[PDB]
UniProtKB/Swiss-Prot annotation:
A peptide binds at residues 57, 59, 62. The RING-H2 zinc finger is an atypical RING finger with a His ligand in place of the fourth Cys of the classical motif. The UBR-type zinc finger forms a pocket that mediates recognition of type 1 N-degrons. It exhibits preference for arginine in the first position. It binds N-degrons with a methylated arginine in the first position. It comes from Homo sapiens (Human). Belongs to the E3 ubiquitin-protein ligase UBR1-like family. Broadly expressed, with highest levels in skeletal muscle, kidney and pancreas. Present in acinar cells of the pancreas (at protein level). It is found in: Cytoplasm, Cytosol. Zn(2+) 1 binds at residues 8, 33, 36, 58, 60, 72. A zinc finger (UBR-type) spans 6-77. The lineage of its organism: Eukaryota, Metazoa, Chordata, Craniata, Vertebrata. Zn(2+) 2 binds at residues 8, 21, 24, 33, 36, 42, 45, 58. Zn(2+) 3 binds at residues 21, 24, 36, 42, 45, 60, 72, 75. This is E3 ubiquitin-protein ligase UBR1. It is linked to Johanson-Blizzard syndrome: This disorder includes congenital exocrine pancreatic insufficiency, multiple malformations such as nasal wing aplasia, and intellectual disability. Pancreas of individuals with JBS do not express UBR1 and show intrauterine-onset destructive pancreatitis.
């Protein structure tokens, strides 16, 4: 419902591509799904793509994961 979809929360499946902003990630485990990455400032930053082995989740919206621009435009309040 609306509460479960207010933030991204995408859970990755094996074979999907994750994105991390190397400039803004607090640590290497901070990741974004493709849509949030492409809808965020980090599309313009130094980034790393990493194919998921399944599991993990998108960190769009977590101030404690990103030094700047924690929300993509879609999820930004
Ligand atoms: Zn996302
Ligand atoms: Zn997002
Ligand atoms: Zn960034």
């Amino acid at each position: 419902g609306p509460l479960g979809s207010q933030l991204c929360g995408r859970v990755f499946k094996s074979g999907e591509t994750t994105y991390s902003c190397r400039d803004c990630a607090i640590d290497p485990t901070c990741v974004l799904c493709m849509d949030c990455f492409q809808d965020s400032v980090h599309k313009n930053h130094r980034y790393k793509m990493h194919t998921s082995t399944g599991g993990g989740f998108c960190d769009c919206g977590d101030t404690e994961a990103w030094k700047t621009g924690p929300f993509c435009v879609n999820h930004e309040p």
